[PDB]
Amino acid sequence: MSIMSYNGGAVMAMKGKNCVAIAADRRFGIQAQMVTTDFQKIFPMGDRLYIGLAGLATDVQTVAQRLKFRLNLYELKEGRQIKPYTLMSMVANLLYEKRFGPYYTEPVIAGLDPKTFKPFICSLDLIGCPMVTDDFVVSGTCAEQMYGMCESLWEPNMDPDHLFETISQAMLNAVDRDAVSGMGVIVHIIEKDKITTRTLKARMD
Amino acid sequence: MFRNQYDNDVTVWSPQGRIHQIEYAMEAVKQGSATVGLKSKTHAVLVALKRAQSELAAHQKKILHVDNHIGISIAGLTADARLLCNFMRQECLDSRFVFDRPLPVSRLVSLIGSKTQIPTQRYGRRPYGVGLLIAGYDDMGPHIFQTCPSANYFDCRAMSIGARSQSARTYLERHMSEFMECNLNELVKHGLRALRETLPAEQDLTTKNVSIGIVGKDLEFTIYDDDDVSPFL
Amino acid sequence: MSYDRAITVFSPDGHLFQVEYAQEAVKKGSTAVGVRGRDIVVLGVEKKSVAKLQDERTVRKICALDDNVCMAFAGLTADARIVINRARVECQSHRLTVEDPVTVEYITRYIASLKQRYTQSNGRRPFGISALIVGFDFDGTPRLYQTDPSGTYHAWKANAIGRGAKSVREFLEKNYTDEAIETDDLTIKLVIKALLEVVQSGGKNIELAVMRRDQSLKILNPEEIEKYVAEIEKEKEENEKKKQKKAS
Amino acid sequence: RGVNTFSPEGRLFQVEYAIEAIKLGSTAIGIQTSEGVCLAVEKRITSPLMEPSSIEKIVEIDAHIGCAMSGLIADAKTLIDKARVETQNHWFTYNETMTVESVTQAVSNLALQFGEEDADPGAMSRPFGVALLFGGVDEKGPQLFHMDPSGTFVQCDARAIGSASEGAQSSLQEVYHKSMTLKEAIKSSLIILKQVMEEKLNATNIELATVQPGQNFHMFTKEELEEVIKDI
Amino acid sequence: TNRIETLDPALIRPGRIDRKIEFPLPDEKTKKRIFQIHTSRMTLADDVTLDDLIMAKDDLSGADIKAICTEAGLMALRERRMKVTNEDFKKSKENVLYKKQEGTPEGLYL
Amino acid sequence: MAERGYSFSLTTFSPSGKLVQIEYALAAVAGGAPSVGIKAANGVVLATEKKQKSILYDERSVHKVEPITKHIGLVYSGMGPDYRVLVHRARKLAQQYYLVYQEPIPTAQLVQRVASVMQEYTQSGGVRPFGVSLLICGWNEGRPYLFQSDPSGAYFAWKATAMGKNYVNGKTFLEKRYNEDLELEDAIHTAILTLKESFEGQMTEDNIEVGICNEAGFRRLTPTEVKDYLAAIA
Amino acid sequence: MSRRYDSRTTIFSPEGRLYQVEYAMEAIGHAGTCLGILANDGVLLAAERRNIHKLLDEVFFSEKIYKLNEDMACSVAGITSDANVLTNELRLIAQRYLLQYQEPIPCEQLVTALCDIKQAYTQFGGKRPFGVSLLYIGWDKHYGFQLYQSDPSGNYGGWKATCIGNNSAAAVSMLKQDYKEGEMTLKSALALAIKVLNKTMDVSKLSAEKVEIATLTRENGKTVIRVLKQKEVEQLIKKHEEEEAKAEREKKEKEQKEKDK
Amino acid sequence: MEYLIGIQGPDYVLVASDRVAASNIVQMKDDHDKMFKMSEKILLLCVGEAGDTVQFAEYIQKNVQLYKMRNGYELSPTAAANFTRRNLADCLRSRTPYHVNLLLAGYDEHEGPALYYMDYLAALAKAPFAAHGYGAFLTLSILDRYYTPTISRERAVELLRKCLEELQKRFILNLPTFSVRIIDKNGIHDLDNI
């Protein structure tokens, strides 16, 4: 359909108090023909910082590798850690170069800084403009609907156990929206003492 | 001393302000063959000597057909001369394409000069060490020029290059008045005589070395080669 | 800057000094010999080792290009590698076009061409290394070609190059001019003998690597050389006694 | 101390040096006769473990022009690649025959590139150290030219170049004649070639070739060489 | 002269001087030969391993060798013994090695 | 030419294994007016002397401390023109790189860039390296600060250092007096004393230039402010 | 002319080598000792620290030891100025390889890049040469632990144990003896380094501040990288000192036992 | 036309590859197969534009062998796939048109075999079995139904047989059957077709 839509995909992040959460889909087919129900589109760079990317799969692989190159070298020269903010910027600069070309990607950053102990989320646009997110973060083609759900479901205070229910149902609602049958999803639940990874049970065709 | 210094600088200037490079270049012209140039200013002739290194050889040409109304004799090394000659032929070709005019040989000669002069005026370029007698039959008649690798452009009514140039010059000045604006035949005889003056003169006249080349009112570029000069002898 | 400038100079009396000095640089280097049989081509090299903290992981003079052609050298390790690389791509350029591997001679010609090219061109100079090039093609004919930094290449039956060349060259001259018969066992034996004279004893100083056809490239065991060494001593003593005893 | 120098004499240094380098090489002989050009050479040998079978120094540029070269042998390998192609290019363009002489000029332009100055466009720092005897057959019949390392060409009918050249050329005169048999010549050539040698006369260090109109450029084989030995 | 490549060909002049004589570097066998004469002079013992010291040596000419013995001989003299031991040879071989080198290696051409 | 000239460098390996031009620059450094630096830990103090030699001057015209950034500052000993130029290129590089990012500058990275420009000039010919030595002074958070940069291309950390004429003698004075906990006001008193000891031609509120890095980085002292300290202990 | 400024540099001569190349070696020799011991368990790296003062500061442990990879580290011998330029390109090529190949660069390949640079300069470039030597402490997942060495002369080696820096000849000899072909562990190595290091040092007192020591071992990821702390280093030294005292004491007891002199 | 099927047994990989040899608009000959054997550890199948396939394949063969000789080591086939993918990823963006689908069939010496499918949007995936082209439609239902993770060797040969009978039955194309290859760690063999 589009230049991002041939394999669809959506990604959600929600914030809790003293924790943050990132959930995503998995599926890779070729056009509309589903071959496999796997394909990670979220990678992390260091434990706690998570980056979710949402272009075309082809683009995503190349961009994730670019961010690795840059970040590693940067980290090396300064000789101390990178911050979440720093990753956000970096993405922008990269986002700006790709704007002439047909690589269009939407990233989302999530993580909780544990050398500062604050939660951090952002979304970024495919024309390169960074927009600092709050409380909920959306990505995917389904976004208009997804936004609707996130404004409704949220409540100002959240515990990992409540946060878990919120994302799960969000994810459940989200898979029905796909025309590309993007079945399979992962959750990562992040604390500044622990990370949980959960693959979830959902519809199968 | 400082002979090596003066070779090493092509930007050379001395207390007497001389430029040795030019000097060297002049010795190289004198090393070449014997050539004379003569014009009546309605006909122009050049006797040129073409020589051979050894017995089992045969003479190498020093009369070049540059064009079907213009031409030269070379006096100095063969290799550099070839390079210059391509530039001048192509300059004649665009004149023909664009303008469809022959173009004054006078105008031509002056242009070639600049392009050489400017690389002596900076790093690189050794002297080219060939001097030329350039003839051509233009709109206002034939004209004769001496091009030097010092880019010294002069029109003369006759001239000579080759060791013992001066000898033949003095005869040309003497016979100068006799040349007038006629007779083909006469110009050549004087040339044959004159050419004898350029040589050591212990070497007797030969028909295989000499070569006679004419351009004139209704003439263009023609060469008399070997035996062919005997009819006109 | 761009630095076109001739680093090289030109001959003052018909002698390129820099190329005279390149031959000296070869005299200082190692000793290599190559022998050809008719199902075998042997490349021997000598070693100087007194370290035993050094790994034998290390690269060796006999270098792998295509699967039946090897290159042995004298000079510096560094320079030789650049030469190897150029060959390794080149075989592959050919592998694509000709759809088969080419002749040995052809490979040699390319390397040679760069070396004379660097003398003749401004603002460059050749490495100054000399090599032994050896291999086979589809045929069982064995090939030994010699490359030298005078920008030339040539065929030999036998060759020895490097330090102390004169003594061995003549030895070798005796050794193989009564053989029009293969004797591969003896050929290796004779090569170790040839090489023995420069090491100053010790198989511990001697490496033979054998290339026989059908894709057989071997570096000998410590033990195989030791067996060969024992056979040479036993035969010399037995023969000395034997010549006096025969009186014929 | 430039080599971009013209020289105070005005006679460039580098060209003069080349002749010396040449005096160190072998001897190469050419006689062109009334019909046919012969080129004879010494490819030499020295050791018994050498294969000069491999070696050559007389090459056919094409099937109607050849050349024998003499001097710093590696340079001549560069020299031929350029020429051979240039000839071949004329066949693509007009599918026609080139003159021996046209081919010789083309290569002489390339003889001048030495220096990085502004009389020569740089690529080389120095010239080719070789002379060549360029032969061919065309409608101007069999002809021979002597390519002079001085980047110039002179025409010839008989020439020797080599270490021995001073003597050889003298020897070449008595035997030369404006009309002489081709076969007769080959014997005459053989005599001068014999005189120069210190090493054995065998068919494994000397090489003959001729060009005749009736059979193209032909390199002479061993069996043929051995027969020529028998006659003299 | 230490090095003859310092010299001038004017200085040589062929047809006076025609001979240029070059001492090879230390060659392994030679070291043992030179040594056998130096030890003969000195006391010797049945716990000496002549090869082992020569083997341990590389690129050392006769003077250092003549020197090693002399050095060692002094140590012994302090002990007031005329018997020589391995140990003596080791300290002296180490002192001379310590002093000549501080360079880094250009080997490993294999 | 326009691309001809000397491709290799003036500086050259010696059988000494020293670098001649480099050796000379320690001399070039030597000639400098007296400089010091004190790190007050929470603060930083850098100080130098303005020599004066013509009564004819204006204002306090050119400085010898210029701000690269709003957080790092340079002072030097060596040649003045070189200093102006050195500051311009760096100053350009500091802003461009750290406006791509919005993060504020790390100290080490500036040092890495100044040293490279110094080093490329050692690598290449035609142009000669600069013959200045710098004190890179900054403040940021709880990080260490006060760094020195050589015309050599080398860097080192320090707590205290001195430059200019009689550098070795002043440093020996410095070494003894400078110990443990001190105050930003206190560090200034000491630096004036250490400069006076090196040489006093005089000191006025215009022979001295003192700058600090403390509250929110680099701040420039008033002329009156310093004068208060001169009275506070002469 | 168009060039005549030059001093006829970077050319050959009857020397048959290159003058400038030779020169560099002596400067390598000056610089503080670095030692590599390679064992069947781990890799031990130790380097001896130059001039330190109380006005001078420690901002890292890293001041002779530099990480080129998350399984490679090196000790650099040579002037600081040159080395930092060189180091960056070396880090950078590993990242190319990482991009394409999507797994770490072979150790041998990374060593190959450095010699290639140098060699180009010696054939012709217009830029003066340099001289740096690295001692490589490295690992692999199908070839095990690797230690290598590089020299500017374009000769690199592999070693069980090597040392370079001041008193290179003597240190190499001692190192050769104390060693045993295989049968080596880290604990044996801790002693081995110091024993050899002390004998090259002129300063009679040994202290944890004059040394840097590190080991690269494996357990997790590809490796665990250990940077040894000053108290731990001091502890090794004292323990070791007490062993030298102890050896000496046993020897004196044997001399008395033979019959005292 | 263009079709390629694969199945990875835990002991070998069978692949079905295309055949032609005189194909314009007629059939008169079929013998040639658009596959190149990348080495003896990895084999590669391809379909796409006919000219582009040969041009692409040869560059990749040339390079992989250089690395083998230079390292004196062999790359993992997984390692090879990302490399191949990276090259094709450039191309897509550029003016030149390589947008062909590749199948890298590989055997890992001490990791067991692995099968990779490459698309023309550039996308690399591993599947125990997949297929592409016109062939795929018919085959994949059989493969899903008859195959069960880690089936025997004997079972695969029967399963491949069924495909040819389906292709015959339903009727598609105009040339008959496929060419089948066996890739193993004993190298590459051949499964004859009717």
Swiss-Prot record, chain A:
Assigned keywords, A-Z: Acetylation, Cytoplasm, Host-virus interaction, Nucleus, Proteasome
Known function: Non-catalytic component of the 20S core proteasome complex involved in the proteolytic degradation of most intracellular proteins. This complex plays numerous essential roles within the cell by associating with different regulatory particles. Associated with two 19S regulatory particles, forms the 26S proteasome and thus participates in the ATP-dependent degradation of ubiquitinated proteins.
Name the UniProt record assigns to this protein: Proteasome subunit beta type-3
Keyword Transport included in the entry's annotation: no
Compartments where located: Cytoplasm; Nucleus
Example of a GO biological process term: proteasome-mediated ubiquitin-dependent protein catabolic process
Annotated Gene Ontology cellular component terms: cytoplasm; cytosol; extracellular exosome; nucleoplasm; nucleus; proteasome complex; proteasome core complex; proteasome core complex, beta-subunit complex
Positions of post-translational N6-acetyllysine modification: K77
UniProt entry tagged with the keyword Acetylation: yes
Subunit structure: The 26S proteasome consists of a 20S proteasome core and two 19S regulatory subunits. The 20S proteasome core is a barrel-shaped complex made of 28 subunits that are arranged in four stacked rings. The two outer rings are each formed by seven alpha subunits, and the two inner rings are formed by seven beta subunits. The proteolytic activity is exerted by three beta-subunits PSMB5, PSMB6 and PSMB7.
CDD domains xref list: proteasome_beta_type_3
Residues bearing the modification N-acetylserine: S2
Superkingdom of the source species: Eukaryota
Induction: Up-regulated in asthenozoospermic sperm.
Family: Belongs to the peptidase T1B family.
From Swiss-Prot, chain D:
TM spans (from-to): none
Phosphothreonine, modified sites: T46
GO cellular component: cytoplasm; cytosol; extracellular exosome; extracellular region; ficolin-1-rich granule lumen; nucleoplasm; nucleus; proteasome complex
Location of the protein in the cell: Cytoplasm; Nucleus
Residues carrying sugar: S189
UniProt-recorded name of the protein: Proteasome subunit alpha type-5
GO biological process per UniProt: proteasome-mediated ubiquitin-dependent protein catabolic process
UniProtKB keywords: Acetylation, Cytoplasm, Glycoprotein, Nucleus, Phosphoprotein, Proteasome
Top-rank lineage group of the source organism: Eukaryota
Record-stated family: Belongs to the peptidase T1A family.
Tissue: Expressed in fetal brain (at protein level).
Pfam families per the UniProt record, alphabetical: Proteasome (PF00227), Proteasome_A_N (PF10584)
NCBIfam families per record: PRK03996.1
Subunit structure, interactors included: The 26S proteasome consists of a 20S proteasome core and two 19S regulatory subunits. The 20S proteasome core is a barrel-shaped complex made of 28 subunits that are arranged in four stacked rings. The two outer rings are each formed by seven alpha subunits, and the two inner rings are formed by seven beta subunits. The proteolytic activity is exerted by three beta-subunits PSMB5, PSMB6 and PSMB7. PSMA5 interacts directly with the PSMG1-PSMG2 heterodimer which promotes 20S proteasome assembly.
Chain positions found as Phosphoserine: S7, S47, S54
Induction cue: Up-regulated in colon cancer cell lines. Up-regulated in fetal Down syndrome (DS) brain (at protein level). May be the target of the transcriptional activator NFE2L2.
UniProtKB/Swiss-Prot annotation, chain E:
Subcellular location: Cytoplasm; Nucleus; Membrane
Sites bearing Phosphothreonine, chain numbering: T104
Domain of life: Eukaryota
Location of Phosphotyrosine modifications: Y109
Self-association and partners: Component of the 19S proteasome regulatory particle complex. The 26S proteasome consists of a 20S core particle (CP) and two 19S regulatory subunits (RP). The regulatory particle is made of a lid composed of 9 subunits, a base containing 6 ATPases including PSMC1 and few additional components. Interacts with SCA7. Interacts with NGLY1. Interacts with PAAF1.
Similarity comment text for this entry: Belongs to the AAA ATPase family.
Known function: Component of the 26S proteasome, a multiprotein complex involved in the ATP-dependent degradation of ubiquitinated proteins. This complex plays a key role in the maintenance of protein homeostasis by removing misfolded or damaged proteins, which could impair cellular functions, and by removing proteins whose functions are no longer required. Therefore, the proteasome participates in numerous cellular processes, including cell cycle progression, apoptosis, or DNA damage repair.
Disease: Birk-Aharoni syndrome: An autosomal recessive disorder characterized by failure to thrive, severe developmental delay, intellectual disability, spastic tetraplegia with central hypotonia, chorea, hearing loss, micropenis and undescended testes, as well as mild elevation of liver enzymes.
Protein name: 26S proteasome regulatory subunit 4
Gene behind this protein: PSMC1
Curated annotation (Swiss-Prot), chain F:
Primary localization class, coarse: cytoplasm
InterPro entries, per the entry: Ntn_hydrolases_N, Proteasome_alpha, Proteasome_alpha-type, Proteasome_asu_N, Proteasome_sua/b
GO cellular component terms attached to this protein's record: cytoplasm; cytosol; extracellular exosome; extracellular region; ficolin-1-rich granule lumen; nucleoplasm; nucleus; P-body
Keywords: Acetylation, Cytoplasm, Nucleus, Phosphoprotein, Proteasome
Positions carrying Phosphotyrosine: Y6, Y24, Y76, Y121
Subcellular location: Cytoplasm; Nucleus
Record-listed Phosphoserine modification sites: S7, S14, S16
Transmembrane regions: none
Disulfide pairings: none
Protein family per UniProt: Belongs to the peptidase T1A family.
Function: Component of the 20S core proteasome complex involved in the proteolytic degradation of most intracellular proteins. This complex plays numerous essential roles within the cell by associating with different regulatory particles. Associated with two 19S regulatory particles, forms the 26S proteasome and thus participates in the ATP-dependent degradation of ubiquitinated proteins.
Protein name: Proteasome subunit alpha type-2
Phylogenetic placement of the source organism: Eukaryota, Metazoa, Chordata, Craniata, Vertebrata
Encoding gene (name): PSMA2
